[PDB]
Amino acid sequence: VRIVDVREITKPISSTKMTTSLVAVVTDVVREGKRVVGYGFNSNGRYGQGGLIRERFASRILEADPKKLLNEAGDNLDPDKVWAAMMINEKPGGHGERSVAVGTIDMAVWDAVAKIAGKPLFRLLAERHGVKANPRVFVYAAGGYYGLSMLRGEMRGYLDRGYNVVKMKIGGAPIEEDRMRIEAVLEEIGKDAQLAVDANGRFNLETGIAYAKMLRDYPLFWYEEVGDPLDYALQAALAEFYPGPMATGENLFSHQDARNLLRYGGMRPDRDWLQFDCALSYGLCEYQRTLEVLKTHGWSPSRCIPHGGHQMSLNIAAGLGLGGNESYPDLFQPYGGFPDGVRVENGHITMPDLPGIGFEGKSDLYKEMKALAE
Ligand SMILES: [Mg+2]
Questions:
Q1: Which of 201, 211, 269, 360 is the most exposed place for a label (fewest CB within 10 A)?
Q2: In this UniProt entry, which residues are annotated as the site Transition state stabilizer?
Q3: Of the residues 115, 307, 310, 362, which is catalytic?
Q4: Which residues in the chain are immediately followed by a break of C to N over 2.5 Å?
Q5: Which residue in 95, 169, 255, 362 is the catalytic one?
Q6: C-alpha radius of gyration, the chain, whole number
Q7: Residue 192 · residue 159 · CB < 8 Å
Q8: Are 331 and 44 in contact (CB under 8 A)?
Q9: Residue 307 is a catalytic residue
Q10: Which residues sit in the known binding site for Mg(2+)?
């Protein structure tokens, strides 16, 4: 059991200059007459880090003594050992681009590890955590970008796709104009679904409070990322004006930053949502440390709905008992989406028992991966 290679390729994202970096972790382990290769990539929103992967991380893994990257029985790779190996010579703090680089590699390490074990990643994770996995995952549709009729049509399209929770953007127009967009969508979906709004961290305290007063008059699913991701005091101050659920975290990339959010964000453990993106935040090895941080603060992993609409998110959700996943209908293909055949029904999908992350089960995506390394 050894990692023979680490291939990477970067390309623009499908339809401003956003990119996706795909990685391949090749091993010497063979399964059912075939070399096991792990694949991984970065969620949308942040630039692919194929550069750092090549320049710094990839070599550390290869130049590492294999006999030191194995589990106890030495019959498989130890994800944490590999993680620690690629993180040598890295100073504390500065959780930005490198978190995306490591997260993409980590995705591949786990994909391979699960394949070598011969089971679905979510099944393996549940096992490692001493519990049974729940293949049924709640998934909401994220969109509502920047008239009212077209917005309505967008949301209606999601409902006719099986979604019962949709999210739209706010803060990109005057507060009264957004009220119009919100009432429009609320009328369109009626009793068939719930609506979430996302400010994308645009608001300062006063604007956040102003929107809170407008938003609280509506039965919203949640109010997301009101201000700067690191302005914990601002988030804590919002509780006074908004009893309803709030969400944030997609732009915090370390367990240290997550710990600070729980210490100083004044969020409500019984109804708020944490959106840390596993893929963008040093990967699953790090996400598990973030979950321990949740525990130390009395939060349940069920409060997590990771940013990033892809199979890795689906696996960690079903595998770690998370609150759900997000999906961007028809976007970021072929990386985003579900395995071929699975569809959204009453706001949920059911994970098929595919080995590893399940990429091989999404033709359009796998063709991309084998074309990189096989
Ligand atoms: Mg968001």
A1: 269
A2: 44, 167, 326
A3: 307
A4: 15, 146
A5: 169
A6: 20
A7: yes
A8: yes
A9: yes
A10: 198, 224, 250
Which of 184, 245, 238 is CA-nearest to residue 212? Answer: 238
Q: For residue 249, what is the DSSP state?
A: -
Same domain, 259 and 241: yes
Between the two ends of the chain, the Cα-to-Cα distance in Å is: 17
Phi, psi of 80, rounded to the nearest 5 degrees: -70, -35
Is 44 in contact with 19 (CB distance < 8 Å)? no
Q: Distance from the CA of 238 to the center of ligand 1, in angstroms? A: 17
Phi/psi for 168 (5° steps) reads -130, 165
Alpha carbons 275 and 309: distance in angstroms, whole number:
12
Contacts of 108 (CB under 8 A, 6+ apart): 23, 24, 25, 38, 39, 40
CB 200 within 8 A of CB 228: no
Are 4 and 26 contacting, i.e. CB atoms less than 8 angstroms apart?
yes
Domain span at 280: 119-374
CA of 329 to the centre of ligand 1 (A): 15
- Cβ of 22: how many Cβ atoms within 10 Å? 24
Q: Which residues neighbour ligand 1 (ion) by CB within 5 Å?
A: 198
Same domain for 108 and 186, yes or no, is no
Find, among 293, 287, 329, the residue nearest to 306 by Cα.
287
Based on the fold, state whether residues 372 and 344 are members of the same structural domain: yes
Is residue 318 within 8 A of residue 305, CB to CB? The reply is: no
Asked if residues 319 and 125 have their Cβ atoms less than 8 Å apart, the reply is yes
Contact 312, 107 (CB under 8 A): yes
Helices (H), 139-174: 148-159
115 is catalytic: no
- Residue 73 burial class via C-beta count within 10 angstroms: exposed 0-12, middle 13-18, buried 19 and up: exposed
Q: Which residue type occupies 228?
A: D
Number of domains in the chain: 2
In the reported structure, the alpha carbon of residue 45 is separated from the centroid of ligand 1 by a whole-number distance in angstroms of: 10
State the method.
Answer: X-ray
Can you give the resolution of this entry in Å? 1.9
